[model samples]
Target: DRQGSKIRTNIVTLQQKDESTATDMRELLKEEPSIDFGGGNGTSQFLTLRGMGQNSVDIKVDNAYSDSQILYHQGRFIVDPALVKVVSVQKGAGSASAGIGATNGAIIAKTVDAQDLLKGLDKNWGVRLNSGFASNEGVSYGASVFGKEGNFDGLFSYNRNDEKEYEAGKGFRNFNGGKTVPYSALDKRSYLAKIGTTFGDGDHRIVLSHMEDQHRGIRTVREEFTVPYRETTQSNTNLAYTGKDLGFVEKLDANAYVLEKKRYSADDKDNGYAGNVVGPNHTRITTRGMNFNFDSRLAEQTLLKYGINYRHQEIKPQAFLNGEFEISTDEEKAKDKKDMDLVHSYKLSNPTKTDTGAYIEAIHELDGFTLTGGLRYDRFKVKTHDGKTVSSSNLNPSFGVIWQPHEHWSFSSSHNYASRSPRLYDALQTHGKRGIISIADGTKAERARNTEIGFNYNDGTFAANGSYFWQTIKDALANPQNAVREAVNAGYIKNHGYELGASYRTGGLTAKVGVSHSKPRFYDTHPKKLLSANPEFGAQVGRAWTASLAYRFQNPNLEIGWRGRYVQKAVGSILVAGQKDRKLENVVRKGFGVNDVFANWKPLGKDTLNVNLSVNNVFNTFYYPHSQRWTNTLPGVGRDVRLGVNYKF
Candidate 1:
């Protein structure tokens, strides 16, 4: 990564998608990556790698430690894409080899089993049902049932959703002292039960899971509509145990975790933020983690893996500012905001983390060039409670080569090195004004070195894959404003990229395509804050394509037939401001496109039925992915239609 480019995935090919399903291709790779999904529908879920956000991403499921430190301010998400089986993404710098809150790069999800979907159902059962409606006031429903007898497997599911108001951009949103700003609507009831067991020829397996989610919030869009009626309610819970291989090695795996999060808010200056009356805030999070790893070959070419991880987090905050808490259904406004105490709280206490790693690889078949090499070492530690402490130790290395004389075709190249360490809100978040709009403290620990080359082709009806990358970063971290988010080993950063994917099939019809290009840049630091969000002119220039069409069916009780997707828009962004010393290009960049469809049905046979329908921004477009100046929202996400169903027993 002498100057940027990185993208590696295959956390199970992003959790399987032969034609959708992997949470709809993970929201279509989160709209072609530039990462940052903090916008609801999932209460600030978290993801910001290249742009370094969410306190520098680091999330895991299979290798344990899912999150630490409000893991996205009151965490959310409990796997379950029917219990996901894989999903992976690790960008720029020392990506903790698939663990830890990836200093600024990492996304791993690996949950799911029952022999990865009942291998050859000796005795299998299923059930599913779903519903939907949307257009300002959305609604959804769900049901599920599963079965397996031989190796012991079972699953049960439930889902719910509700929505209202959202179509702003000059209409239906008022706050300049007017009114109407109410997008408020959300509801979810989640339940998943899983139990798995199987072991043949040593590749062992074990699983147990329980998950829950409930969030309610509305209007981060009605900016000035005369604030009042702000609401938010959150919830989280997950208990897990995943295991694979333990007979010493051979693709070993492990996980153990417990998580709980709760956040509830109700603002009142009638709705604060200038109206003043703020209050009704309560937050809580308790997290725990454990991880383990082992992958072995040792000979026959050499391969080895190592792992260890630990985390503990507890965050707590309770009411104040504007008052009023249940208090047994209102006791004189909870005894006058609890008797004018204006409840303010704090509790980060005991935040603990520990990590360890080791990796080695060797596969140099040589001849047509099939070399491979690897090395790794990572050690990190943290502890605080008036007993400050911080530590970091890193040494990552990797290299690759692949070339085949035939069988369709193949060619590959690779290089890797990573590093990162920074947390505790990047150094003990401390800012005043109860709402705490900012937090930053002496940050340090950012590193990167990546390089890549790619190519692969296949027959069997046509297939393609491509890659090109570069990355270079050192002690890089900058926030310029928003109170200040620091990290500057004398700031210098670079990220370069290229990616291409293709697909096609005949007869029943199938098609797919993808393209990506990036040129990220920023250096030495403060060129007026890199022209205030000017990564090589907000690099993200040219090329972004996706087209899909599918049709397949086998008969009576197994019917499935539609799939369509399209996207084309993502251009360079410009926003340069430096005042006085001059530098002003002011924001400019806009692009948007959307179209999706999916269908599935079963009229009773697998013990029940199946159904689905989707429509998202079909043509309702109002877009802006980048335009900086602050105070006027962009990147609008509107229009939604979804319906789901499934049943089995």
Candidate 2:
């Protein structure tokens, strides 16, 4: 049931940095308990909700679908943070009006509305430059120039990030790793442009805009760094329309988008460590899509939203050379440049798949009570060998109710059902030198059901929210061992969890806290066994907390703030078939605290000139992401600092 779920949401007011896109977004604040994007290096951007992969999460930007056609592969964000305004998170079991990949939940990133961009423009122009230094990777720099006059606006930005690898802990199951790895040595660049106009005062509005982003870089998989090197380039664009009055409809908005992204990489042997030599590796990936949406209000207390979305992607990875070892003994080190297949070259590549979906949602409010619901349906199809078609479909639905039982107190509850088909890569991937991963047929659709409840308290000076969610996914996809990893429907997994968060604010100072817990389990039918990602009874929960303080000096035009976060340990992967007796090593990623201090200074009125500085990971905690294999799992980055200057006209 990955499709046809309706979900309606009302805006939630935020405080401190909570309202800023930089703080609410997963990429900016690693605060979500049940969700983990990646570690501190920024090498990975995978989102897991209730312990589910990105393939099962639906991400939409400005009402347009952003998922790739080969839905199995991980997802990527293609926008600049400086150009965004709001990001909304919808948890597992999408609304009734959602489509493909809505099984876990959805992330809707809404950019600054047309008016927010026009309100304060006397001349409307600004320039900013940000630079930082870190212990593990060296130096980082980001800069942007933006201007707006009347109905026109444009922005250009660039970023340079380079980092070295970390020291991986022992007893982990990573394919490639070793001492002294180079994990995230990357460089990225981006560009954006937009233009719009408004007429008839505030009652009627029409706006059109465009945005584009492109990036290129080299990255590593884990600390061992055994796999080949990867070089990537990706780009995206969106054209949209927003309106206030349209005949019988109060608010009507529409948007269309096109995306083009590509990635290519060289083999690992050329980039591998001493003792390891794999042949040349090559990969070419391309993806494109078109998206559209419409919104309208039905009554004073009800709103209706609908959209159509589509996308297609292709991935071709090949190896033109083979690896060879020259050693005097089986366990001894081998001689370099004296092995087999040094001259001959071959072609090893395969075509990928295409994914499509559509959905709708509605919201209603009466008195102090609110009721919301949504449903979505989706269809997925992929091509196997000789153009064979493998297809699956899902129907997803969700509903929720909220009541303000008292003047300053509120209560809410909701339920969602979702589903997803197999990933394009998992369906036909034939990895390794000997075509180890094989599948006779594609996997069945994975499904899940989620229930949630929460309480909200808001007084004149303080506000807080507490929530709990539990989810169960059926037919979860997993690969216990190489033996059945390539086999269709060989692995099954399940996870359940809850989350809690609260915040308080006073003059110039703010504080917040959050935590989460989950229990994940895996079952292998071939051996009739059950396994847990955490200790048999140990909690699988991961928790994090953040605190910040901001103060401003009116006469001097200066602002300063400090932020900190703490993260707990996470459960590693389960043991393999032959290693059942061994209690899977409980890899305790060193959980250390981090602190960041930032200051902003404006000599001239708010716009002429400004200076900013920030220190990230002040304490340098050593932690690793779940995606990283054990051998290359290194400690997180240490003490980082950033400085910036800005000008406005």
Candidate 3:
């Protein structure tokens, strides 16, 4: 089971880009067939893992979880691509040790350390500068400086990104029958700082880190309305420690962090619709947490690891049309143009939640066989501004076994159970237009059970891994009323998928391929009524694949590569009781293939200077994967060229 389980994890390592790739993460994510995005544009898009979207997947940076709240219905995790060093993804719920909020999967991103920048150099200090421009968007530039001496090290980096409205493929049209996609623009600045020191004869270490990111621009959903000005800001601070060889414990890691995310928008104007004004709006989410873990050797063939974690989350949403006066009619809304008194339309009284969890996992190995098991318990309480409270608890468990009967082959299987507490938004969402608040009583925590099996084959020239997973979720949250948006534990869902990846390398050339398939369904009752019968309720891509090949030249350091992706057409929605069209043509999104090429050059024969060029959507194919929502009126961008140059000293 362990062998099958291990193959469900995917890791993408980011190094200094050469003539072989793009400097942005968009291309990096495209390399993985199973990973996809929903709503929003660029980095602001919500990440989807294994056909599951939103809060089902947990995202962490440098071991600290950041903001997962969607502010004003349009916010995403803000992390500068320039600072990321690695991205690790776990497919499906394979490990109970993954902690809460990971009902489907987990994504972990690690940033570069000072030692990583100064490696192989006979100097204690280093500096690097990078700049890039994309034809479809605009310009991006960043700089980093690092130093290491004795047991102390420090690093700092800054990035600025400016983008104009990008163009969609010429012939593509969304549900709104629009050719141009608005809200494809961007303007942002990001900063990161880190400091670390070793103590206790190099057996213990301490590090402090901080990150700030902010962006402002005009964005709209479906072009039905226009946002005059919207701004988002995020800040994160972390202090972590690591120790080795401390008494019976062989290793220990601990961290404490605080993350603050805020979103502010000036006004929303109807684009010839109702012509009413909405906004100014302010939403903020603050999170604070601490985590501790330790590893110990229990016996000759057994090792045990355990940890405890706690987090406090708070959400505040503020919206208004005017300051001192209240405008109840559209005529008053249209006449009142100036920013006067901040009339409070909607504001939550600091909705808050506290979560605490503890878990233990053990691994035993003998000969070529290994067994692993883990159990975790979590409890959470939600307090709304109305002085009402709701609480839930869950116990998650996982088990697996792996057998390497041969030197080049291994097999394994695993079973996992996980649960997620309802978020602040899920519990206490108040809309201004309707002024209706959704607070369900007796809402249960979302629960999931999964089983997986797979195998791995590795030889000198080629390596491959494949795995299949099936999952069922209970007490899933959904909308029971179409006329009024409200949350309820009204449906059940079944999800199953498989992933395969293989690679071949020889001489100066390497080739890689990956494929994934997923089938998901929602039902009111097993073998009965389908909850996903509505067009908007179900939009899932069934199959996807990626392939790539690259060649490198030893002299002058140059590499050339080509990559392509194909997604099968996906079903958006099915006919329901009120729908007129039986075919559901409006909701269907046909899949298309996209290709990219990259070249990196270091003509100076040294790592000091490098230039790279990459072109995405080589054919300008006009299509939308099921991931990109149709309501956005945004199709994928067409044939974009990106060029960059980096210098280090």
Candidate 4:
């Protein structure tokens, strides 16, 4: 963008060995102080940006919304990192391009294609095979084949990660009286196939892709019990198209996708392990969505952008021929079996949410600065498994300014407003307790006002940037598990934070350091009173600081780097959904630091054969991410070594 944007982005290459799974993405994202993860387990990890979680943050795979939750304890979305080539996060109030429900921002992931794999190879068609092992975890295997023929390209990839429970720092095995983090062990597999082509004088492109991700193992309703057993999967099929160099329109992008998530009983399959089986349950959450957008040169220095997006999200509990839910128990049958209404039990209203969004934006360059303005309209009809419904429509506006007063310095600020529909609750949990949902008449959308201001300075060898943000949300809807009903009068929420960072490089060495702090508070309807005990949904963490040092060796075709995180202590009264009381149960975590080292080397000095290694938790610090749930009190992993070897032919 001509104007300074708040999008923090990173690209991972096939030669980079530090990342592979969704769990690995968490480590890579740690470079940004404003981003944080709730859990270390790969089974289901949660994330937060500026203290806003699942319902507030927009998470996408291949630019497709997949922030789905089948149960209360699991993560929202996961994919084979092997297929991801780009990761980007837009913080605070972003533009219409950030999509809907981005009250805080969005997490964007783009997958790799034949072009990504064949570009650096010596051949027009090739295959890549990789295998790896982790000292504290397990082993993995992956394969990818890619080729290009005339104007056509195709690729197929597969990945599998199998591991037992991991050890906490210092090899501590105190969780659930087990050798490793209980229920933390699992075997997962991933598959991706994509095909693309260019036509119409090579001015247009179209691609179709499908991904299947599966995690298999035993797990309790809560994932932290025994070696963190995981039983969930993700299926995404996407079709994307792009056109360029058209008269009035500078660019056009269109995408359609079907994303599905499934959760089975902790003991659904016939695994050899003898852990307690939970039930015969199967829960699935699915979304069919699409986005069509374009950009046009409306004026000499002004660009006009427009787009429309829609989604149909629904949840269901599959039943067996015996008339029992896949994860159903006799207690569930004896208690509420007679009251089973598909509308109230399975969200059988065709779609739990009928969503639509449309927007138009403009960005113009003028004098010594640039200005951007846009408007978006969002609508939704949300229905919960408990048979309650609510409808809403709203218009959110956005504005931004960027000024370049010096060749080496620049300033940027953005203001965005969004009114998101009320999010539905977790299907399995809400139904498990037979919880009823209520949407009071005249309920308003969750309206949010996001703002940010920052400056940047850079030369060839050094760079620095920082920003301060203040965001507020009115009529904030409570998370499903929190209130028995959607709280229309839940009052408001305030999130304020700041971030600063700098980097320097010379010769073969580079160094970076950054710090960020985010804090949010929920208030009651009165506004003046601070409702510490309860007011709605969401969470916050303490100030975070990060540093990294690395050196690239030209002689051996290798690069090595060390990264670390130092988190300050935080004390607050907080609780998760379904808390029985408004008790001010205090939560406290102390300051801690963890470090890691990584190296990538090409023994053959080419893409044919590559090797990489990493050592995690150099000191084996014992700590837990304060932003996540503390029921299991899972701590960071201990010192561990990982090695990978890749070959292409």
Candidate 5:
């Protein structure tokens, strides 16, 4: 029944990247053939799933949304790898339960708890200290304290990441001919605390946690360019609950959270970017939300689920005017030219948004065939800078079927639709143009339709799978880069892809390989231009081929593995005009193959301590990511040697 409830599933377990050197999510998510990770670390990272942009992917940790986005140039998923237990990915819109803006897909991250780190130790309390260093980056170190007493448990973890500008692949240089990528250095501090306990004879569980992750650096105005400054990011506090066997409800998950993302730039006006303005500009974004869901059995062969969620976010932007931030009593906005000049074109902007939703799902299993269906309602309300509320609503639907005729094989097909209202934008930028991306009053919601089919076969030691998916998005919005950078609706995007893979595991050895291909493009209907072009929602990446080979020796408690990805060349189109017909032409993006090797060992032949070594980008092949925007000359890091050691007592 558990297997019959889902359509397509890709899960990354803790054990998959449990080594001491798995300090980033790139290593953990490598198995998925549809994901392309760009940027390096800290605020620079971005992802593309199924040919869709990072903003199109929904990311959550323990049912808490990681949607705190203040700056367009900053990364969205700001999570520490040490705190994650599992990562579940959906290639496309699988169901309505995934919520709004899931037009492309979702990335669900489950965090670790006290029990996850203390297994097989025979101790109620444990302390683990670890440190790592990268030849190209810098050093990182941390410690975790976890323990369980009777029915109660608690944990605390801290990690410090000190990173520096990394050089490009061998013989590569930056746009200015520098050996290293400028403005790529970032130092971060991460702190986490969790407490939980079981109740009702262990049938129910509850946990409370607080997390703080902040980065310090002097970066570009957009944080993406190596062209050019203290800006603190955020922290989260959450209370989560899990329950089973409550009346007719067999399972439940609920949570409430508060997220605060702040940017504090004090007196660095001479540092550049926005430095030439006056004092410093800052933005404070506060997000508060809650989610509740439960699963119940309707009959001997049927299951039903219900869910409700709410989220409110407000962006408060302050720019240094004639002297400082603001005092609302005066009519400063009407002062025109002088005020605008002092603020360096930054306007007094305040935008607040609220999203509320409810969803229902059902599954029926009989005679080896299963059917699943889901429906959802979403409401998005936004209060503009002028304090006008624009409320938008949508109804989403999904359905799927699965045939499990035997233990070794299963066939599945699914169809679903997702909708997204205009998302909020960061107002405290240099030129203040991006802030115009904030939801406009007359904007309409975008709709995405997704369809896919899959076949899988698995035995004790061998498994194989094949999949094909097609998705279309209507009313794509336009994000202008010039003076009229307003976000208005106008394009149609279509994406099609296929995946093939097989895996083998026998005794202490495991080997797997997979290939994925996607073609993404959009037909533009903007006023001045009308032709096929790269998708505005996201960029197109090359087809990917992935492989992994690993072998573990039980006697020595050691595992060694090799991972590689070969990206195939892809061609896209853009509108070019010679004062006549706008002709769409092909632009070819070359591809490359990158590989890594790693080893994890227990020198004592037990779990008391561990050591890990990894060599990334082994050949130091220079490469570029087509999706990382312009000004990205040195995207790939040079050959990097990383090493780590962990001790537990």
Candidate 6:
């Protein structure tokens, strides 16, 4: 049904991986250079689409929205890739159906359903098991059991992964001490269970599902007083129903879900800051949310979509003294001592944030073209521990049109306006070492206006897609280095980019390639300089390209592929030195190209058993991709080998 939509979208179906490298969302998105994943830690990664950072993207699981949680050294989109059946990306200024936080794009991850796994199986029940190991990363194991009978189906799955530090190419070093930097290690477990049944006229169906994910890891933090151990848990319960010919609607689909996320970090050691010992403390963040959405087709040529979402989040941060703390300097004595007391007691007056929003979209089909329009309204309220309340609201609108000249050619153009509310930390954070940082009253929400045009072509064995986009943000907020001491509505950012992709297939051979280039610039709009002098933002990347070739042998059901990626050098980073007399220096990040080889085979020429192998970073070259900040600039892994085995019954 979505294939006939006017919006541009990309859908990825999970496939057997030759290596553990392709098991996560980050790896799955590597196929498109326009999307960049930031942050260094494997447990926590941020997404940037066409230079638009995480704050501008909306993440969804099934039909429910996911909340954004950004604590110190922890910022991630929670999901277990093992249970993901498909991922769909709606790119470039999505319509109102995208809901809140979607300034640039929306990413939807759908989990496997019982029916999806039971299809084509003769037995009413089945079981599948998989295990894999990497030369340096460690091991992963997973199992799934599914059954279908009558009008009902059910499935349950579990996955576990334990990996050690990954080795890097030569000369990879930490930015601060120039010491060798080893990738962080991680342990994770995830579970998913789903049940569905058809009732009434059989056109009425209901589905219920539950998911749980837990992970723990130790990551290097450049700003941390000491290395910290962090653990996070994310879980969800969902219910959905679909009814045919409901009153004036030809079809109706509705869903509701509850999501919960908790993050805990315990300090393992103590480090002194300017003679004051701070330490062995803990920080916890908990988030709970609910989301509901409805879709209806009013007529053969018209469709309506609407949704409402709400989330409440809280943060508890603590600090402890290894012993009795000592005041070092006059500035320390003069500063407000409340932070120390608050940290010691692990107490806050009100560290919570609430977000609520609703959106609606309408689509109409006309001769040779389709028109779409949408509207969204959002409200944000934050209650700080200091008994402060900050609130904001915004209403956004979008319009788009698509023309289908022929079965072989289609073109689309769109204009959209979207807004992002300030994060909790941005609104409520205080008690810095330098005392409380001030936020300007009436700091408006960050806003963006985007215009894009694209075309698609497909003819038999050949297909192509290309698009160009221009976006500008107003009252953009940033904690830009060498600028202000607090998050501020700093300036305006103008970003423009183009993406092109093509693929060809014949017989059992296939080839594909994609190219992307973007230019981003920031201009100060505030009377006071609240942004870095550097013209570019951290999320911007230079030109990049990807190419791949693959072939499959039907007799043995074997597949082999080679993939390569190239990223050009990126610049426009500012380094601050000197405390009293601050100086700014421009830093350029170098880029490189990497390649990988993968193979999948069924030795017995049967689907019941399989083996997979991969050699990544074929050249073992040293390189780094563009990330949001220097701390996230970890080097890419080198010369990694992985193997996997699977059995089905």
TM-scores for all candidates: the values are: 0.29, 0.74, 0.87, 0.88, 0.88, 0.85
Across residues 260-357, which tens digit of lDDT does each residue of candidate 4 receive?
88776644334212112244556778889999898999778999999998988887655312112222315356434444432234432322887789
On TM-score, who's better, 3 or 4?
4
Give the poorly placed runs of model 1, Cα more than 4 Å off: 1-51, 54-96, 99-101, 105-137, 152-172, 175-197, 201-490, 493-649
For residues 86-196, could you state the per-residue lDDT of candidate 6 as single tens digits?
777766566776666666676788888776555435588888788988875679989999987788889999998887766556565554544334446678889999998
RMSD (CA, Å), each prediction: 24.8, 7.5, 5.6, 5.0, 5.1, 4.8
Candidate 5 local lDDT, residue 611: 87
lDDT per residue for candidate 5 within 1-649, as digits (tens), equals 1222122343665554456476777656666677777655565766677777656676667666644465566556457777776777666775867655667776777777878778637789998788889998889888999999988999998888888998878777767998788878878888889999998999988899998877787666555556524666667899999999999899998889987777766643653333245466666778888988889999998999889878888776554232232223455556544443444444434667788889898989998799999998888787655345677788889888888899888888888888776666543442343223334456666778988888888897998888788888777764532221344566767888888788899988999988877776666677654332322245567888999899999977898989888888766542222112243234666788889898999887766677889988799877876555533433777788889887777
lDDT of each: 0.47, 0.50, 0.67, 0.70, 0.70, 0.65
Candidate 2 lDDT over 298-341, as tens digits, reads 88779877766565656554532222222222443332232223
Q: Which ten-residue region of model 3 has the weakest summed lDDT?
A: 426-435
Better of 1 and 4 by TM-score: 4
Q: Positional deviation of 220 in candidate 1, in angstroms?
A: 16
Give the local distance difference test score of model 5: 0.70
Model 5 clashes, total count: 2
- Report the lDDT of model 4 for residue 578: 18
What are the per-residue Cα lDDT tens digits for candidate 1 across 385-497?
Answer: 22245666777776666777776777776666665554443111221122222223443456667776777777879887776777776666444223112223446556767
Q: Where in model 6 is the C-alpha error above 4 Å?
A: 1-10, 15-21, 38-41, 65-67, 72-74, 170-180, 222-228, 266-284, 296-299, 316-347, 426-440, 480-488, 532-538, 574-582, 603-609, 628-632
Better of 3 and 5 by lDDT: 5
